[PDB]
Design an enzyme around this catalytic site. Structure first.
Site, mmCIF file in Angstrom:
data_model
loop_
_atom_site.group_PDB
_atom_site.id
_atom_site.type_symbol
_atom_site.label_atom_id
_atom_site.label_comp_id
_atom_site.label_asym_id
_atom_site.label_seq_id
_atom_site.Cartn_x
_atom_site.Cartn_y
_atom_site.Cartn_z
ATOM 1 N N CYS A 46 0.686 -1.300 -0.223
ATOM 2 C CA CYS A 46 -0.051 -0.040 -0.066
ATOM 3 C C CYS A 46 0.897 1.283 0.034
ATOM 4 O O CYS A 46 2.067 1.231 0.562
ATOM 5 C CB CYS A 46 -1.140 0.072 0.973
ATOM 6 S SG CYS A 46 -1.999 1.507 1.364
ATOM 7 N N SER A 48 0.615 3.812 1.817
ATOM 8 C CA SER A 48 0.763 4.171 2.983
ATOM 9 C C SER A 48 1.987 3.534 3.961
ATOM 10 O O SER A 48 2.761 3.869 4.480
ATOM 11 C CB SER A 48 -0.312 3.992 4.236
ATOM 12 O OG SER A 48 -1.381 4.756 3.700
ATOM 13 N N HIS A 51 4.859 5.551 2.668
ATOM 14 C CA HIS A 51 4.830 6.831 3.415
ATOM 15 C C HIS A 51 5.791 6.699 4.652
ATOM 16 O O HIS A 51 6.479 7.440 4.953
ATOM 17 C CB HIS A 51 3.531 7.304 3.864
ATOM 18 C CG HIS A 51 2.559 7.893 2.842
ATOM 19 N ND1 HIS A 51 3.125 8.163 1.521
ATOM 20 C CD2 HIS A 51 1.312 8.193 2.718
ATOM 21 C CE1 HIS A 51 2.001 8.621 0.644
ATOM 22 N NE2 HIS A 51 1.079 8.517 1.418
ATOM 23 N N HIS A 67 0.378 -3.564 6.482
ATOM 24 C CA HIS A 67 -1.046 -3.777 7.111
ATOM 25 C C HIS A 67 -1.909 -4.072 6.255
ATOM 26 O O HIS A 67 -3.165 -4.464 7.003
ATOM 27 C CB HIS A 67 -1.172 -2.119 7.570
ATOM 28 C CG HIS A 67 -1.507 -1.314 6.364
ATOM 29 N ND1 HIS A 67 -0.428 -0.772 5.776
ATOM 30 C CD2 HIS A 67 -2.329 -0.921 5.846
ATOM 31 C CE1 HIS A 67 -0.736 0.232 4.812
ATOM 32 N NE2 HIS A 67 -2.107 -0.092 4.734
ATOM 33 N N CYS A 174 -7.328 -3.261 3.396
ATOM 34 C CA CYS A 174 -7.060 -1.729 3.344
ATOM 35 C C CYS A 174 -7.693 -1.007 2.046
ATOM 36 O O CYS A 174 -8.623 -0.608 1.954
ATOM 37 C CB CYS A 174 -5.455 -1.176 3.311
ATOM 38 S SG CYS A 174 -5.488 0.544 3.419
HETATM 39 N N1 LIG Z 1 -8.138 6.970 4.223
HETATM 40 C C1 LIG Z 1 -7.587 5.721 4.346
HETATM 41 O O1 LIG Z 1 -8.029 5.004 4.920
HETATM 42 C C2 LIG Z 1 -6.241 5.170 3.213
HETATM 43 C C3 LIG Z 1 -6.146 3.845 2.997
HETATM 44 C C4 LIG Z 1 -5.248 3.398 2.022
HETATM 45 C C5 LIG Z 1 -4.289 4.280 1.503
HETATM 46 N N2 LIG Z 1 -4.618 5.849 1.547
HETATM 47 C C6 LIG Z 1 -3.888 6.820 0.963
HETATM 48 O O2 LIG Z 1 -4.448 7.104 -0.264
HETATM 49 C C7 LIG Z 1 -3.545 7.594 -1.360
HETATM 50 C C8 LIG Z 1 -3.556 6.735 -2.475
HETATM 51 O O3 LIG Z 1 -2.888 5.273 -1.970
HETATM 52 P P1 LIG Z 1 -2.552 4.310 -3.270
HETATM 53 O O4 LIG Z 1 -2.233 3.098 -2.597
HETATM 54 O O5 LIG Z 1 -3.802 4.257 -4.347
HETATM 55 O O6 LIG Z 1 -1.438 5.104 -3.956
HETATM 56 P P2 LIG Z 1 -0.961 4.977 -5.550
HETATM 57 O O7 LIG Z 1 0.521 5.433 -5.541
HETATM 58 O O8 LIG Z 1 -1.043 3.628 -6.097
HETATM 59 O O9 LIG Z 1 -1.869 6.085 -6.239
HETATM 60 C C9 LIG Z 1 -1.701 7.530 -6.225
HETATM 61 C C10 LIG Z 1 -1.879 7.968 -7.715
HETATM 62 O O10 LIG Z 1 -1.950 9.448 -7.792
HETATM 63 C C11 LIG Z 1 -1.486 9.719 -8.880
HETATM 64 N N3 LIG Z 1 -0.881 11.125 -8.625
HETATM 65 C C12 LIG Z 1 0.375 11.564 -7.839
HETATM 66 N N4 LIG Z 1 0.464 12.925 -7.928
HETATM 67 C C13 LIG Z 1 -0.678 13.409 -8.783
HETATM 68 C C14 LIG Z 1 -0.982 14.685 -8.939
HETATM 69 N N5 LIG Z 1 -0.388 15.844 -8.611
HETATM 70 N N6 LIG Z 1 -2.178 14.544 -9.788
HETATM 71 C C15 LIG Z 1 -2.885 13.754 -9.934
HETATM 72 N N7 LIG Z 1 -2.782 12.545 -9.706
HETATM 73 C C16 LIG Z 1 -1.614 12.368 -9.099
HETATM 74 C C17 LIG Z 1 -0.292 8.752 -9.093
HETATM 75 O O11 LIG Z 1 0.174 8.761 -10.363
HETATM 76 C C18 LIG Z 1 -0.753 7.476 -8.740
HETATM 77 O O12 LIG Z 1 -1.584 6.714 -9.919
HETATM 78 C C19 LIG Z 1 -2.273 7.446 -0.386
HETATM 79 O O13 LIG Z 1 -1.849 8.921 0.066
HETATM 80 C C20 LIG Z 1 -2.558 6.361 0.789
HETATM 81 O O14 LIG Z 1 -1.514 6.895 1.820
HETATM 82 C C21 LIG Z 1 -5.442 6.265 2.829
HETATM 83 ZN ZN LIG Z 2 -3.170 0.951 3.300
#
Ligand SMILES: NC(=O)c1ccc[n+]([C@@H]2O[C@H](COP(=O)([O-])OP(=O)(O)OC[C@H]3O[C@@H](n4cnc5c(N)ncnc54)[C@H](O)[C@@H]3O)[C@@H](O)[C@H]2O)c1
Ligand SMILES: [Zn+2]
Ligand SMILES: NC(=O)c1ccc[n+]([C@@H]2O[C@H](COP(=O)([O-])OP(=O)(O)OC[C@H]3O[C@@H](n4cnc5c(N)ncnc54)[C@H](O)[C@@H]3O)[C@@H](O)[C@H]2O)c1
Ligand SMILES: OCc1c(F)c(F)c(F)c(F)c1F
Ligand SMILES: OCc1c(F)c(F)c(F)c(F)c1F
Ligand SMILES: [Zn+2]
Ligand SMILES: [Zn+2]
Ligand SMILES: [Zn+2]
Lengths: 374, 374
Positions: A46, A48, A51, A67, A174
């Site tokens: 993930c 995160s 991160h 996780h 997640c």
């Molecule tokens: N709220 C929650 O419970 C929770 C759970 C899981 C993940 N997250 C968070 O959600 C986010 C996404 O996670 P993921 O695993 O899908 O990540 P990921 O890296 O797979 O996807 C993020 C996407 O954003 C795009 N991106 C980057 N910069 C950009 C910009 N300026 N404009 C538009 N698009 C842009 C990337 O190209 C990518 O496809 C992360 O910040 C993660 O920590 C939150």
């Molecule tokens: Zn996650």
């Protein structure tokens, strides 16, 4: 057997920020009262978890991260009633204690026993079950799934269907549930609505899946990496846009496309600027914007509150708004009943020993979810 | 008759910011197609009118302000169908055209014909009906009620009960409806909940009225002017707090008082800092915060989006979320049926000619609402 005994096994230890994971032998203590020791079968990578490596998310190091996973119960401590040895389980990065004011609230899911708001990196009792080269190693979000075995508190684990394929259903731990619930439960996307989804990774794709399931008529995917667009269309995006292709800010483009603003927008990246863009692009009188992405530690955004005064709603959520222990088994049952798909999220399956390679695929833009298998 | 003729009458003209109003003769043109000329009977002094004087709220000058009022139709232009000469009416600072995407949306109320987002200070046709000293004078929010006669577009006027007391029901035209609706319609306050209300002026008092009507168990008023607390308790506040009494920031005080955050908070002042405080004080996983106060022109707030990601909802609204022309007559009917009280809001009455004294009363902190009579 192994019950009651220290287990020596393989794990991926993060000793410092911004370094590769170190794969080596750790000792895993047996579970104390109300704790469960789990033999891992599969875990997803993930954003995160990345991160934690990058410092975007601060948690005590050294640490065993991970996780989003699934495994099989090896042993239970005294007093455990909700799982037994041999059960398939998913660890819960957001626990469900069932006793706090949030657990008791019809709409709350961010249980006060969580280890996110003020991370300690331990079990609930304030100690660690992990040692490595003579040193204690921290836990992460009460899960720590980058290890052949982990120990979790009972409020941080759900029993799931004995026939489920663990190499798929780990995503319900997640990313799938987070995105799907953000659409269906948090936003409450309506039939015939227009939606905009910022970020087309594993989580954003899951938000699209939810918007489509909720009957949205238009779902506009937004990403700066156009290689993400084909899969987003496959799972239900009607159109995709790359902000880099336009002279105007993308909020303006989206407001024009949607003839005065979208009904529901979602930030699924983790950037402050895109949070404010996503807000702005929803219709000013009745639009709703949901933040799902995690931005860097201790950074504030700036915005004009007239955005809200005209009528917009802005909200965020952890884990799609789902009460974790109640919802995870139901989601796995729904998957087994073919109510949604998980394969579109899985782009790579690697042995656990290739964890660093899996992280490289995510950072490079090349994967959605890589599943590691033990 | 006066029908079809220019009316010379007195109005309160604002020639420049930060000055007293000038009470003097203006010329009021007859109504054009789909316009209504009204003989004013009563108008309230709302803080937003003072915002025009202070430059907090920017609209073109010179101007005839005033927006919270009631009167009697003197004449109607061609094609008007919803009112007639002799009807009692309330001008609507938020129009209801009935045709735009917001008017057709079940929740939306901020009609796209409004003059708040991009203020012109005209009638809908981009011209003015007011002359003073031979110079054109701007309108305010399509109402301009600080005048013996005004002209409004048909979408900015509601017919009301012929027996209603205009010197009371003028408050349904802005402050009462805004506060009450913010609680009952926008927040959707629930039975047994805890509410915090920042600002105990006429609108904050009406939010308390709404919270009480909705069955809140605890309603904590917050104001730095302790002279405001006695009336806030009369209308339903269970406790009042003055942030200047405390060493700790008031969000911490409220979080502790509510054993972990309030269910619903309301910002009813218009300050950037209290908007963020009010969000912070609602419970992090399921709290709702509504912005009611009007911020200073073009200024941005700074906030941490982790406040949202845990689960908070943050929203704002104009006019309590009510669709104006549908809602105003019903609110008057409910007032006539004693469903809510307006007298608690009325602390002073003055003749129109003493408008500057009425503004002095507001600014000194002495009044809630002063009603001016023509
Ligand atoms: N709220 C929650 O419970 C929770 C759970 C899981 C993940 N997250 C968070 O959600 C986010 C996404 O996670 P993921 O695993 O899908 O990540 P990921 O890296 O797979 O996807 C993020 C996407 O954003 C795009 N991106 C980057 N910069 C950009 C910009 N300026 N404009 C538009 N698009 C842009 C990337 O190209 C990518 O496809 C992360 O910040 C993660 O920590 C939150
Ligand atoms: Zn996650
Ligand atoms: N959203 C809308 O449709 C709408 C409609 C009406 C009025 N308004 C706005 O609502 C706000 C309230 O209007 P009102 O007529 O009740 O105004 P008001 O000035 O009578 O009341 C504001 C109160 O806030 C208090 N206050 C000032 N600074 C404070 C601080 N730092 N902390 C706590 N309390 C503080 C004052 O003592 C006062 O009692 C104004 O901004 C007004 O422009 C909005
Ligand atoms: O600071 C870390 C942190 C987060 F990453 C969150 F997503 C969140 F909701 C929260 F409250 C928090 F404290
Ligand atoms: O001349 C433009 C102009 C107008 F169109 C007005 F409606 C007005 F009130 C005014 F003062 C003005 F200068
Ligand atoms: Zn709990
Ligand atoms: Zn309209
Ligand atoms: Zn007002």
């Amino acid at each position: 057997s192994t019950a009651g005994k220290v287990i020596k096994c393989k794990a991926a230890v993060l000793w410092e920020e911004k370094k590769p994971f170190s794969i080596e032998e750790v000792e895993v203590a047996p579970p104390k009262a109300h704790e469960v020791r789990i033999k891992m079968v599969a875990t997803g990578i993930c954003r995160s978890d990345d991160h934690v490596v990058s410092g975007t998310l601060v948690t005590p190091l050294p640490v065993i991260a991970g996780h989003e996973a699934a495994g099989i119960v090896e042993s239970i401590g005294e007093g455990v009633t909700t799982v037994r040895p041999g059960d398939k389980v998913i660890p819960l990065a957001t626990p469900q204690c069932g006793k706090c004011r949030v657990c008791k609230h019809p709409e709350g899911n961010f249980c006060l026993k969580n280890d996110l708001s003020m991370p300690r990196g331990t079990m609930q009792d304030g100690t660690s079950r992990f040692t490595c080269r003579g040193k204690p190693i921290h836990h992460f979000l009460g899960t720590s799934t980058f290890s052949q075995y982990t120990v979790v508190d009972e409020i941080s684990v759900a029993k799931i269907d004995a026939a489920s394929p663990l190499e798929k259903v780990c995503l319900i731990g997640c990313g799938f549930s987070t995105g799907y619930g953000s659409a269906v439960k948090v936003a409450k996307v309506t039939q015939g609505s227009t939606c905009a989804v910022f970020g087309l990774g594993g989580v954003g794709l899951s938000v699209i899946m939810g918007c489509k399931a909720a009957g949205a008529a238009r779902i506009i995917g937004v990403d700066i990496n156009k290689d993400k667009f084909a899969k987003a269309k496959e799972v239900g995006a009607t159109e995709c846009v790359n902000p880099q292709d336009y002279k105007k800010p993308i909020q303006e483009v989206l407001t024009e496309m949607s003839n005065g603003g979208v009904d529901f927008s979602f930030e699924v990246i983790g950037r402050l600027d895109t949070m404010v863009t996503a807000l702005s692009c929803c219709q000013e009188a009745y639009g709703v914007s949901v933040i799902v992405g995690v931005p860097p530690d201790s950074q504030n955004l700036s915005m004009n509150p007239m955005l809200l005064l005209s009528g917009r709603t802005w909200k965020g959520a952890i884990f799609g708004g789902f009460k974790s222990k109640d919802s995870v088994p139901k989601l796995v049952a729904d998957f087994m009943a073919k109510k949604f798909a998980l394969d579109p999220l899985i782009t790579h399956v690697l042995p656990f020993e290739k964890i660093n390679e899996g992280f490289d695929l995510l950072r490079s833009g090349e994967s959605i979810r890589t599943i590691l298998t033990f």
